[PDB]
Coordinates of N, CA and C in Angstrom, one line a residue:
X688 N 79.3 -224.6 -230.3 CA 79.7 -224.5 -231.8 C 81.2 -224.7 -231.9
X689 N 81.5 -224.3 -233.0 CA 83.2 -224.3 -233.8 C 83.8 -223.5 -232.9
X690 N 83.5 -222.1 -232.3 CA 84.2 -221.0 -232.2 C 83.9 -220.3 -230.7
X691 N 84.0 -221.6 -229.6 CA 83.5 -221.5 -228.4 C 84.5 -220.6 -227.5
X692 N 83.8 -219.8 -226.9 CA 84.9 -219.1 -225.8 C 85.7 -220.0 -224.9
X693 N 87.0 -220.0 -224.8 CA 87.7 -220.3 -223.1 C 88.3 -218.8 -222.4
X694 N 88.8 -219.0 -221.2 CA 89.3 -218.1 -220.3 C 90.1 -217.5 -221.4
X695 N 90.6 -216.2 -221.3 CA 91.7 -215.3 -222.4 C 90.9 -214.6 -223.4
X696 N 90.0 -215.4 -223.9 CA 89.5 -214.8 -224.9 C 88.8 -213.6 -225.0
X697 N 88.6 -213.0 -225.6 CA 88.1 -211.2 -225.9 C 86.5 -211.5 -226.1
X698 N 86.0 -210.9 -225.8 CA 84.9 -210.8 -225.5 C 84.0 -210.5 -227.0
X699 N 83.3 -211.5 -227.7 CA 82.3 -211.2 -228.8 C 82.3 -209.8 -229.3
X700 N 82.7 -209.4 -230.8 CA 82.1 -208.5 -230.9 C 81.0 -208.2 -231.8
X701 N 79.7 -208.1 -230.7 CA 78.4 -208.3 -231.3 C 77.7 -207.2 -230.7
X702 N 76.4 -207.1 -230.8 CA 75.9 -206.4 -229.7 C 74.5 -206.6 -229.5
X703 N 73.7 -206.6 -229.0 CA 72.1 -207.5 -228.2 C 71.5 -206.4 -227.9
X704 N 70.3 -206.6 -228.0 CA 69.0 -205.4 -227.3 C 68.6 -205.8 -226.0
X705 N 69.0 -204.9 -225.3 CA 68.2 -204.6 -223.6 C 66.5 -205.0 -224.0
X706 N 66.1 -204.6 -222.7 CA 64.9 -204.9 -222.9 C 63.9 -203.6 -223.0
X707 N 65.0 -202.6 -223.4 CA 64.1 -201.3 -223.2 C 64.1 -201.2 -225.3
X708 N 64.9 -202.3 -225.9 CA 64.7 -202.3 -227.1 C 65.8 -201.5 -227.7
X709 N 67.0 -201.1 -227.1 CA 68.1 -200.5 -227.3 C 69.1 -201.5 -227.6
X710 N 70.1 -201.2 -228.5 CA 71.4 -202.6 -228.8 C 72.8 -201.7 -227.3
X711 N 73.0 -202.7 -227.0 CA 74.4 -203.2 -226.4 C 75.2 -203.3 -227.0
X712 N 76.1 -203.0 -227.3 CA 77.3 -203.2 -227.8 C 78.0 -204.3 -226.7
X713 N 78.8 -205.2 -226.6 CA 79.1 -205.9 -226.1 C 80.7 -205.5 -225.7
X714 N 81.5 -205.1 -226.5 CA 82.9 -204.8 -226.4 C 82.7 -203.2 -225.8
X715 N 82.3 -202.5 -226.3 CA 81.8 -200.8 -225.1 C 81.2 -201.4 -223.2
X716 N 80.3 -202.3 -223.9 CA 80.2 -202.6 -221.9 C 81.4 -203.0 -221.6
X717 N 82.3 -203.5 -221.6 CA 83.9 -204.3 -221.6 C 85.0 -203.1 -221.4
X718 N 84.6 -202.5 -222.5 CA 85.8 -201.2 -222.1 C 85.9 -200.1 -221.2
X719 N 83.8 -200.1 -220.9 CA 83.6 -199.1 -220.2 C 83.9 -199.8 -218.1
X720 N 83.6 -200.3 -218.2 CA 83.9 -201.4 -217.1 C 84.8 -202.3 -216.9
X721 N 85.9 -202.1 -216.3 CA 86.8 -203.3 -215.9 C 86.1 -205.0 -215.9
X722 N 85.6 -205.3 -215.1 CA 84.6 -206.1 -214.8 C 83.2 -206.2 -215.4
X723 N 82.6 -207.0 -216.1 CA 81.5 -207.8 -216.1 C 80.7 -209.1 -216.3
X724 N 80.0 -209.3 -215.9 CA 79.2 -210.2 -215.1 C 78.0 -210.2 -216.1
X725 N 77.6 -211.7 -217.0 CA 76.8 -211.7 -218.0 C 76.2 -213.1 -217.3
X726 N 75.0 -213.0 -216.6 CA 74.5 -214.6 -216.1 C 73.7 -214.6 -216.8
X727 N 73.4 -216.3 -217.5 CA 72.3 -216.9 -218.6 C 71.8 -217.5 -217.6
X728 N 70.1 -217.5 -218.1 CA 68.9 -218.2 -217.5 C 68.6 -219.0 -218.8
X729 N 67.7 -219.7 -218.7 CA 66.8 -220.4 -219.6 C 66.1 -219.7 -220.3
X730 N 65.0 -219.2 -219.4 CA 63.7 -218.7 -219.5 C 63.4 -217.5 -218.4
X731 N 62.9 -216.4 -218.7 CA 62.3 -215.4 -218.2 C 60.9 -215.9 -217.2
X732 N 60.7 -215.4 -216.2 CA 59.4 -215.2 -215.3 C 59.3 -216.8 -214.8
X733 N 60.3 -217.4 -214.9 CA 59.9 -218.8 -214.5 C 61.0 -219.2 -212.6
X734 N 60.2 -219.9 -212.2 CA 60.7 -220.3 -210.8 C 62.5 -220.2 -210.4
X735 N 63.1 -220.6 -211.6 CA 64.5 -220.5 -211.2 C 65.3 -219.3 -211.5
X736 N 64.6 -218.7 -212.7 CA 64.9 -217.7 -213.1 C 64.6 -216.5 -212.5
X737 N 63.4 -216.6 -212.0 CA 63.4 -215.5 -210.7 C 64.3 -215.4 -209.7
X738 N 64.9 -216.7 -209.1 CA 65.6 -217.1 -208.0 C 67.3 -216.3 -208.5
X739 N 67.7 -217.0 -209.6 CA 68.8 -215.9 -210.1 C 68.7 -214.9 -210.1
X740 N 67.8 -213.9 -210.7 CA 67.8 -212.5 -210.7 C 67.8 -212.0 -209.8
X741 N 66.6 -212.4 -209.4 CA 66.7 -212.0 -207.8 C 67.9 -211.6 -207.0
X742 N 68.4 -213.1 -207.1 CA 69.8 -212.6 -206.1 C 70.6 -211.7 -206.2
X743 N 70.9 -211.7 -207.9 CA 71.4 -210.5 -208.6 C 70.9 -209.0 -208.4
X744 N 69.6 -209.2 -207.7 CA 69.1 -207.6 -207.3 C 69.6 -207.8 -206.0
X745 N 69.3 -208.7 -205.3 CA 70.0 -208.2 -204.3 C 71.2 -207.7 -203.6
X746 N 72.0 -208.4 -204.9 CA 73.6 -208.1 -204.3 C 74.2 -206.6 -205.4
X747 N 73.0 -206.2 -206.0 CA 73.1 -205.4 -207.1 C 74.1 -203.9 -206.3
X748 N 73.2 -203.5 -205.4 CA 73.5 -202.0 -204.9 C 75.1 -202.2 -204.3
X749 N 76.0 -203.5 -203.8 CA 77.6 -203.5 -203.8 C 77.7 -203.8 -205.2
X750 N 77.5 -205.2 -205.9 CA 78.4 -205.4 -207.0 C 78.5 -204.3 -208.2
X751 N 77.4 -203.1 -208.2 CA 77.7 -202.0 -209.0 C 79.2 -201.0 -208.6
X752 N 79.5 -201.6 -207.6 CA 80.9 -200.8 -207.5 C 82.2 -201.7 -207.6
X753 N 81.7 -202.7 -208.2 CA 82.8 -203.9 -208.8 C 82.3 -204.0 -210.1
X754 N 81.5 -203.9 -210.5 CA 81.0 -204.9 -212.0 C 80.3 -204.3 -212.6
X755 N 79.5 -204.1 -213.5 CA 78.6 -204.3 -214.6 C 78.1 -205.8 -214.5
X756 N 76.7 -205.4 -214.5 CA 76.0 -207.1 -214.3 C 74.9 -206.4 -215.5
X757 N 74.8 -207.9 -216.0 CA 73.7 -208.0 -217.5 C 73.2 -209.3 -217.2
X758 N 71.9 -210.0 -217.5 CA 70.9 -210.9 -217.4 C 71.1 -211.4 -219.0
X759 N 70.8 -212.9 -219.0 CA 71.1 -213.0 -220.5 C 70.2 -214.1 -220.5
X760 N 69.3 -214.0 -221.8 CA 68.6 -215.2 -222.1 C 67.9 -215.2 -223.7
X761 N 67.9 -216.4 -224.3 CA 67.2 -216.3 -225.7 C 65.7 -215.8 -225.7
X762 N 65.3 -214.9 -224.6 CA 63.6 -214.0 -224.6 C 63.9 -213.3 -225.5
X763 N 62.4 -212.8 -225.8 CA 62.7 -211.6 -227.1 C 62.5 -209.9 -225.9
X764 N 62.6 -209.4 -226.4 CA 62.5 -207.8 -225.7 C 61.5 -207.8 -224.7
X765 N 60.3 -208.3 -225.3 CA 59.2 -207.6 -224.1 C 58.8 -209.0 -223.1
X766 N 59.1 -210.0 -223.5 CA 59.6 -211.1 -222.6 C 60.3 -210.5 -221.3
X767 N 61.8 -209.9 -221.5 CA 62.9 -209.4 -221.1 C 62.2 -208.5 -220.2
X768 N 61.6 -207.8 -221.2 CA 60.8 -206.2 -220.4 C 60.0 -206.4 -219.2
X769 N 58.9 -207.4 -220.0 CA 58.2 -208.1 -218.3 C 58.7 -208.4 -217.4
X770 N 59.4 -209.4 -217.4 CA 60.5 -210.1 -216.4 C 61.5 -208.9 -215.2
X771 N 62.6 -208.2 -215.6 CA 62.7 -206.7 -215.8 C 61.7 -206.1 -214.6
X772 N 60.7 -205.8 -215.5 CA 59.9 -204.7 -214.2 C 59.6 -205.0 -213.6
X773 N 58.4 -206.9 -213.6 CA 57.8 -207.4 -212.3 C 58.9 -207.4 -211.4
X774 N 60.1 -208.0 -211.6 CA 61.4 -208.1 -210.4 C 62.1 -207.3 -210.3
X775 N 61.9 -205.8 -210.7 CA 62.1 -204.3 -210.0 C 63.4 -204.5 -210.2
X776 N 63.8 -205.3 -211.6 CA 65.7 -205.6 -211.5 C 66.8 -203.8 -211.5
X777 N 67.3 -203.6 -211.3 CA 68.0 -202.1 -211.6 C 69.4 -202.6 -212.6
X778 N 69.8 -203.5 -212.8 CA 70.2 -203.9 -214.5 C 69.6 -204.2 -215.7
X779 N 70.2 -204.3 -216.4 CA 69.7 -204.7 -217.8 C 69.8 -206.3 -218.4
X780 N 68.5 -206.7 -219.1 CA 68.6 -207.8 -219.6 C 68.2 -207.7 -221.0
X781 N 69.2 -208.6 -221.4 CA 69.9 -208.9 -222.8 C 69.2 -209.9 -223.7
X782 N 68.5 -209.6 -224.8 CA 68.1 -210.8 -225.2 C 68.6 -211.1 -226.5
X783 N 68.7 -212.8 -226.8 CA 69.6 -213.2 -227.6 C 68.8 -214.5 -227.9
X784 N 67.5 -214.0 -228.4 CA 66.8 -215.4 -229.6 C 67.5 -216.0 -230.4
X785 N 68.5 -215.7 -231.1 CA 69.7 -216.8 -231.8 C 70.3 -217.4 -231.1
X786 N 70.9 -217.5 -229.6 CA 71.5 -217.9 -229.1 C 73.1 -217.6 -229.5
X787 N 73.3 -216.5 -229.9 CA 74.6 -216.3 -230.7 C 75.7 -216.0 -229.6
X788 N 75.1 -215.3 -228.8 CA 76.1 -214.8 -227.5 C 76.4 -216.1 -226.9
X789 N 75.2 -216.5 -226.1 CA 74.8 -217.9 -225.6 C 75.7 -219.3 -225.8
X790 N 75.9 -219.3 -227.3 CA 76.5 -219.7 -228.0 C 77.9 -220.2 -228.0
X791 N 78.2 -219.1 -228.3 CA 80.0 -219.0 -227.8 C 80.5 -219.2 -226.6
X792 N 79.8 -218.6 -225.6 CA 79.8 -218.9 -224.0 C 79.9 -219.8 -223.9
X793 N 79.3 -221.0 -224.6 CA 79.2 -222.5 -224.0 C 77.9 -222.9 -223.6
X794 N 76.5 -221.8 -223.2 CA 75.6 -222.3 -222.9 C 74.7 -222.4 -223.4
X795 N 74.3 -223.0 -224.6 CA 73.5 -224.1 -225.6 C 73.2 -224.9 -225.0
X796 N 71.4 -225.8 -224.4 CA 71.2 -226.8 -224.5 C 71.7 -227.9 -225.5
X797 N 71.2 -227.6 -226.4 CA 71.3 -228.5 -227.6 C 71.4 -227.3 -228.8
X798 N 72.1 -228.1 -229.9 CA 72.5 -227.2 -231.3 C 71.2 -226.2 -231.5
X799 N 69.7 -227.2 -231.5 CA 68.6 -226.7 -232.0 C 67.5 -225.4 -230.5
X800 N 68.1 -225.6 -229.9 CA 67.4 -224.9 -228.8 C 67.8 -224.8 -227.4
X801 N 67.3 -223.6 -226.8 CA 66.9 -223.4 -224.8 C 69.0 -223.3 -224.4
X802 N 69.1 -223.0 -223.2 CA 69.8 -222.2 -222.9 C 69.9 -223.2 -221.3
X803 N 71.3 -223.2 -221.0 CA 71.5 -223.7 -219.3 C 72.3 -222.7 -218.4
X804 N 71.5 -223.0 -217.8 CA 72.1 -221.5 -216.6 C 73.5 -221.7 -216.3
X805 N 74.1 -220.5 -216.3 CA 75.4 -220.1 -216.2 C 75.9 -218.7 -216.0
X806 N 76.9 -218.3 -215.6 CA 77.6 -217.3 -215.2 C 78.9 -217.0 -216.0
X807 N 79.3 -215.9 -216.5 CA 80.6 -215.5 -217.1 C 81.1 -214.4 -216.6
X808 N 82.6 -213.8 -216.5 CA 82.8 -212.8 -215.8 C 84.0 -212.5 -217.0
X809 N 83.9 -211.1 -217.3 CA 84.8 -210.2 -218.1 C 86.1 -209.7 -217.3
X810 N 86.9 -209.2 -217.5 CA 88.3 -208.7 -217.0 C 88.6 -207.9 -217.9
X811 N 88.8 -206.7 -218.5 CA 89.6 -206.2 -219.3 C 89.3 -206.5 -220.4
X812 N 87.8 -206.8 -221.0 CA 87.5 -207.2 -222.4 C 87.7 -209.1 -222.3
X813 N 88.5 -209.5 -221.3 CA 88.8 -211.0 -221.5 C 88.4 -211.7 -221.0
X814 N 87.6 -212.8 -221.1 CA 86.8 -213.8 -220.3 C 87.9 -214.9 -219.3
X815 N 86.9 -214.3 -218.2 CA 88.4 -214.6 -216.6 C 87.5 -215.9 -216.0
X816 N 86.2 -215.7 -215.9 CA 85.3 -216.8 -215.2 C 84.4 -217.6 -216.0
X817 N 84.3 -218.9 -216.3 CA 83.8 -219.4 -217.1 C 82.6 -220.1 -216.5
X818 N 81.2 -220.3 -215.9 CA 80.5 -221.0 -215.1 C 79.9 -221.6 -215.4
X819 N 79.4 -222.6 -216.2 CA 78.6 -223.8 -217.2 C 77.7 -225.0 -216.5
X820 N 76.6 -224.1 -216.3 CA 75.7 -225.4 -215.7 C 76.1 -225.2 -214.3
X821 N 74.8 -224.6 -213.4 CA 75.1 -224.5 -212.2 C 73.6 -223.8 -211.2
X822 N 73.6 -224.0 -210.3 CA 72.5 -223.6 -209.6 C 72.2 -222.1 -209.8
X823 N 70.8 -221.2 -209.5 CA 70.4 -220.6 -209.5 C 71.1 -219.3 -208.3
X824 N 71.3 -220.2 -206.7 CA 72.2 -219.7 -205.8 C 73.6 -219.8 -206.1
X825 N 74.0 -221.0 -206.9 CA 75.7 -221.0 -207.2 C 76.1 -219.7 -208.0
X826 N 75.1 -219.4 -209.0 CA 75.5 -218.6 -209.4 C 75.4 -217.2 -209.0
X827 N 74.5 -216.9 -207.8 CA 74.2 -215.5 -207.5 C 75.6 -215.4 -206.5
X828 N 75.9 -216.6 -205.7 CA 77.0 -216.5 -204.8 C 78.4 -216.2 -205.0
X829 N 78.5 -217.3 -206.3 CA 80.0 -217.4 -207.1 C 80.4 -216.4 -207.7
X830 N 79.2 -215.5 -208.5 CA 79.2 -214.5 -209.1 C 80.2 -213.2 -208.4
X831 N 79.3 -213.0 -207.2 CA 79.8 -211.9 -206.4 C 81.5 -212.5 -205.9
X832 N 81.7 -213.5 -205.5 CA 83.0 -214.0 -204.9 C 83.8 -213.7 -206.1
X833 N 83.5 -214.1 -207.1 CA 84.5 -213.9 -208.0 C 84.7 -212.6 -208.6
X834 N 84.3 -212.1 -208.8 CA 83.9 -210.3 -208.7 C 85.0 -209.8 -207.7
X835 N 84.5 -210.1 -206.5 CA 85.6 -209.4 -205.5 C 86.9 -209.9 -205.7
X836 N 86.9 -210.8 -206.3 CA 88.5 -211.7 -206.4 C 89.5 -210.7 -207.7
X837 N 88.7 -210.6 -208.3 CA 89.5 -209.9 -209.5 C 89.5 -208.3 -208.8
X838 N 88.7 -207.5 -208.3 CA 88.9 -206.6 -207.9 C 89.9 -206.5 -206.8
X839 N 90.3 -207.5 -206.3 CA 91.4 -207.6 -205.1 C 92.9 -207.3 -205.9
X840 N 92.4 -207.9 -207.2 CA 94.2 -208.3 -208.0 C 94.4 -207.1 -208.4
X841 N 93.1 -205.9 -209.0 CA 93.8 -204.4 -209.3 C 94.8 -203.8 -208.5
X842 N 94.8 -204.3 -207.4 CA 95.3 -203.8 -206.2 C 97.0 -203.5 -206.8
X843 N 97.1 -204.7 -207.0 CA 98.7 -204.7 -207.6 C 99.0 -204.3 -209.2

């Protein structure tokens, strides 16, 4: 759209329903967390989409002591919900049928529909990692790298 995120910019303030049917506030996850980590899929329960989350559970039990990690995709709630429990995720996924979040991020298929996998990473309310179009493993791997990278710079 008109009013697309780059690096610097402040994080949307909107807020999205988990899949337990509860809203997110998007700028409270941000404040409450130094770091977070918003990865877009396409589609819920499907081959690649498992493959991301997945990984995302697996690296879940370190990157909770770096990040906040949220799942993001235009599913509706109980889409989210399914997806969620079959893959025993211990984060939360965000759904965004407008594609409004999605949106701004950069990852829009097209004006009229669907969603391309990607990764974004928060800092202080401000978008530090931008990842647009990228493998299923690129993003479970880069995610975490970059996570530890910003957490290295609190240092100073």
């Amino acid at each position: 759209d008109v009013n697309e995120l780059e690096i610097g910019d402040p994080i949307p303030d909107l807020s999205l329903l988990n899949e337990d049917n509860d809203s997110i506030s998007l700028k409270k996850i941000t404040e409450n967390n130094r770091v977070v980590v918003f990865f877009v899929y396409p589609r819920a329960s499907t081959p690649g989409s498992t493959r991301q989350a997945s990984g995302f559970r697996d690296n879940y039990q370190e990157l909770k002591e770096y990040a906040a990690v949220f799942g993001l995709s235009a599913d509706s709630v109980t889409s989210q919900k399914k997806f969620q429990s079959k893959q025993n995720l211990p984060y939360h996924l965000l759904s965004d049928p407008k594609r409004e979040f999605i949106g701004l991020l950069g990852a829009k298929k097209t004006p009229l529909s669907g969603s391309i996998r990607s990764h974004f990473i928060f800092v202080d309310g401000k978008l530090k990692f931008k990842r647009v179009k990228i493998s299923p493993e690129v993003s479970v791997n880069d995610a975490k790298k970059e996570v530890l990278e910003v957490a290295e710079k609190f240092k100073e």
